[PDB]
Design an enzyme around this catalytic site. Structure first.
Site, PDB file in Angstrom:
ATOM      1  N   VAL A  18       0.856  -1.215   0.000  1.00 51.47           N
ATOM      2  CA  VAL A  18       0.000   0.000   0.000  1.00 51.47           C
ATOM      3  C   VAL A  18       0.882   1.252   0.000  1.00 51.47           C
ATOM      4  O   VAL A  18       1.813   1.314   0.815  1.00 51.47           O
ATOM      5  CB  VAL A  18      -0.999   0.011   1.173  1.00 51.47           C
ATOM      6  CG1 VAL A  18      -2.024   1.127   1.036  1.00 51.47           C
ATOM      7  CG2 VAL A  18      -1.688  -1.333   1.347  1.00 51.47           C
ATOM      8  N   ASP A  36     -12.197  -9.369  11.409  1.00 50.25           N
ATOM      9  CA  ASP A  36     -10.811  -9.109  11.748  1.00 50.25           C
ATOM     10  C   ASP A  36     -10.705  -7.735  12.430  1.00 50.25           C
ATOM     11  O   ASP A  36      -9.807  -6.946  12.100  1.00 50.25           O
ATOM     12  CB  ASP A  36      -9.880  -9.240  10.538  1.00 50.25           C
ATOM     13  CG  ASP A  36      -8.432  -9.558  10.880  1.00 50.25           C
ATOM     14  OD1 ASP A  36      -8.177 -10.109  11.970  1.00 50.25           O
ATOM     15  OD2 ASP A  36      -7.562  -9.234  10.091  1.00 50.25           O
TER      16      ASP A  36
HETATM   17  C1  LIG Z   1      -6.532  -1.630   2.514  1.00 52.01           C
HETATM   18  S1  LIG Z   1      -7.114  -0.926   4.022  1.00 52.01           S
HETATM   19  O1  LIG Z   1      -8.536  -0.708   3.903  1.00 52.01           O
HETATM   20  O2  LIG Z   1      -6.645  -1.694   5.148  1.00 52.01           O
HETATM   21  C2  LIG Z   1      -6.320   0.632   4.194  1.00 52.01           C
HETATM   22  C3  LIG Z   1      -5.113   0.665   4.888  1.00 52.01           C
HETATM   23  C4  LIG Z   1      -4.493   1.883   5.099  1.00 52.01           C
HETATM   24  C5  LIG Z   1      -5.131   3.030   4.625  1.00 52.01           C
HETATM   25 BR1  LIG Z   1      -4.296   4.707   4.950  1.00 52.01          BR
HETATM   26  C6  LIG Z   1      -6.345   3.005   3.922  1.00 52.01           C
HETATM   27  C7  LIG Z   1      -6.945   1.777   3.703  1.00 52.01           C
END
Ligand SMILES: CS(=O)(=O)c1ccc(Br)cc1
Ligand SMILES: CS(=O)(=O)c1ccc(Br)cc1
Ligand SMILES: CS(=O)(=O)c1ccc(Br)cc1
Lengths: 262, 294
Positions: B22, B131
């Site tokens: 990410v 989760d």
């Molecule tokens: C893929 S998620 O939904 O866990 C996520 C993680 C970090 C951010 Br900043 C935004 C979304």
């Protein structure tokens, strides 16, 4: 108790009612398909019943796949040679969504008898995802049935299985069933099953929940009733075979009533 | 989807998962800061992962101020990009790095009230999260907190059928899962939120087990070993064993000493053994503990 989500069933029911309208296929898509017919689709769906039986898939998976298929054929025109590929990718997507243990892609390739390649199945999966815009959490007949079942006084497994059966039969025949929403076919199925087994009728409690009456259900019921009488004669037989099994209380062996007195 | 990568400028990596990484990114046309979750399909022989099909399908329908928003999905033939609203931190990093002397009760109540809102909205739309833990709860600069990471999530039917048993990070996992029950429901998310509530007050996990049996034992030593009176059916459950040590229920003021009577009450109802008696998110919003919420 909590397994019947007492604090959420209404919210859910209302939300499913909204979603079935959005996930609804075009009622007259087959006339606009130059190369496929209701008959071909009936063959496909019957095959998917067999695939579901072979891999011990959930009935929900079957319903989702049909939803994906009709919605796809609603905007994408498909040659008869490719219809099974669409159906394969549909069952794969529905399996990945709904199954604890989906069959592997390879098993999907295997059941098409190497008509198509892994590459083709995978590319069609992407296409279907593009066409549906990842909208796969679609309300099914089953989703409504299982809620209606909570209104039986008392619970009767023969009722439940026969309703599942009848609802499944509706998947086969685009005409007439494409014009009824899942919630309405589920209602017709539930009433017909109940009437058949116990002689009882659509409960007032379900009139409260759904706002449907025997009045508003009558058109689907008359169709479903015919479908049930004619079922031993239908070209497609996989559902009847499936519902002979003890798993489903052998409900396909029950005799349909000759009149509904509706 | 109305997007393309040309319009994003990556800024830094912010996380990594089982199907990709990410990045924090910036929309070069609107200014919007986002989080880009890349899922590589080229490295996949099985096509689009089921986790991703479930995350997109369910988050597309879940629009709530306390649920992270999926803004777009860019679907190439080799890569799948999920564009998310960006939030600067998660609750776990906040508890560690800055909640050293503690999280003020106002903020705890505010957070818990927002988490319940988000979760009630999920349950109302037939989605289990499955989760909930502090790592998966995002906070912004404005004091919002939001459920995130819906890759282990599931669309449920009413009544529920049997779903995956391998669900919920162990410390946050409900007894009914631990005892191998054929069915579990919305109560599992409430359990997680209960563990999280306690964790916000102490900045330490309530049940930090190292195995399923150790996890159960820690729960039992805290809430007492359940019997037929507190939880009808428990001794019939597939992984219930009669040899289980019978620990006494400790008084609840001992479990989380700094917690006031209202807090204790709410927490005891989140951590009820019997999933049928455990409080719903919807009911919990009306608990007296939140009467003074911002
Ligand atoms: C893929 S998620 O939904 O866990 C996520 C993680 C970090 C951010 Br900043 C935004 C979304
Ligand atoms: C009617 S057809 O020959 O096009 C067809 C359709 C689906 C399958 Br599975 C097999 C054959
Ligand atoms: C590419 S798509 O049409 O599947 C899609 C899905 C979710 C969002 Br949010 C936007 C676009």
């Amino acid at each position: 108790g909590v397994n019947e989500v007492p604090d959420y069933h209404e919210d859910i029911h209302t939300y499913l009612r909204e979603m079935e309208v959005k996930c609804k296929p075009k009622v007259g898509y087959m006339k606009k398909q130059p190369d496929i017919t209701n008959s071909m689709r009936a063959i496909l769906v019957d095959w998917l019943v067999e695939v579901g039986e072979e891999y011990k898939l959930q009935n929900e998976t079957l319903h989702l796949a049909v939803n994906y298929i009709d919605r796809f054929l609603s905007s994408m025109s498909v040659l008869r040679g490719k219809l099974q590929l669409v159906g394969t990718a549909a069952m794969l997507l529905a399996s990945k969504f709904e199954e604890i243990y989906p069959p592997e892609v390879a098993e999907f390739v295997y059941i098409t008898d190497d008509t198509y390649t892994k590459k083709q199945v995978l590319r069609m999966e992407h296409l279907v995802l593009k066409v549906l815009a990842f909208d796969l959490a679609a309300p099914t007949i089953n989703q409504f049935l299982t809620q209606y079942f909570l209104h039986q006084q008392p619970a009767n497994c023969k009722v439940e299985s026969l309703a599942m059966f009848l609802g499944e039969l509706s998947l086969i025949d685009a005409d007439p069933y494409l014009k009824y929403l899942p919630s309405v076919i589920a209602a017709a199925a539930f009433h017909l099953a109940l009437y058949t087994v116990t002689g009882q009728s659509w409960p007032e409690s379900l009139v409260q929940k759904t706002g449907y009456t025997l009045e508003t259900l009558k058109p689907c019921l008359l169709d479903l009733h015919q479908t049930y009488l004619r079922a031993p004669q239908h070209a497609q037989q996989s559902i009847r075979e499936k519902y002979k099994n003890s798993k489903y209380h052998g409900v396909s062996l029950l005799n349909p009533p000759e009149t509904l007195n509706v | 989807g109305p997007g393309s990568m040309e319009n994003f400028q990556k800024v830094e990596k912010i996380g990594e998962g089982t199907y990709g990484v990410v990045y924090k990114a910036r929309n070069k046309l609107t200014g919007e800061v986002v989080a880009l979750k890349k899922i590589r399909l080229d490295t996949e022989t099985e096509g689009v992962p089921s986790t991703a099909i479930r995350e997109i399908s369910l988050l597309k329908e879940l629009n709530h101020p306390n649920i992270v928003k999926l803004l777009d999905v860019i679907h190439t033939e080799n890569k799948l990009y999920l564009v998310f609203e960006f939030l600067h931190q998660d609750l776990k990093k906040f508890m560690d790095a800055s909640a050293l002397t503690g999280i003020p009760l106002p903020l705890i109540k505010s957070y818990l009230f927002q988490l319940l809102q988000g979760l009630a909205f999920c349950h109302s739309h037939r989605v289990l999260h499955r989760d909930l833990k502090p790592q998966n709860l995002l906070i912004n600069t404005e004091g919002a907190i939001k459920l995130a990471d819906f890759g282990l999530a599931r669309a449920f039917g009413v009544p529920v059928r049997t779903y995956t048993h391998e669900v919920v990070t162990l410390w946050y996992r409900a007894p009914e899962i631990l005892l191998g029950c054929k069915y579990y429901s919305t109560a599992v998310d409430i359990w997680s939120l209960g563990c999280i509530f306690a964790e916000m007050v102490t900045r330490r996990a309530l049940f930090p087990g190292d195995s399923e049996i150790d996890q159960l034992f820690r729960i039992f030593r805290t809430l007492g070993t359940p019997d037929e009176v507190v939880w009808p059916g428990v001794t019939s459950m597939p992984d219930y064993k009669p040899s289980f040590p019978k620990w006494a229920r400790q008084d609840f003021s001992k479990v989380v000493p700094p917690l006031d009577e209202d807090g204790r009450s709410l927490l005891s109802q989140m951590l009820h053994y019997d999933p049928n008696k455990r409080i719903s998110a919807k009911a919990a919003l009306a608990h007296p503990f939140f009467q003074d919420v911002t």
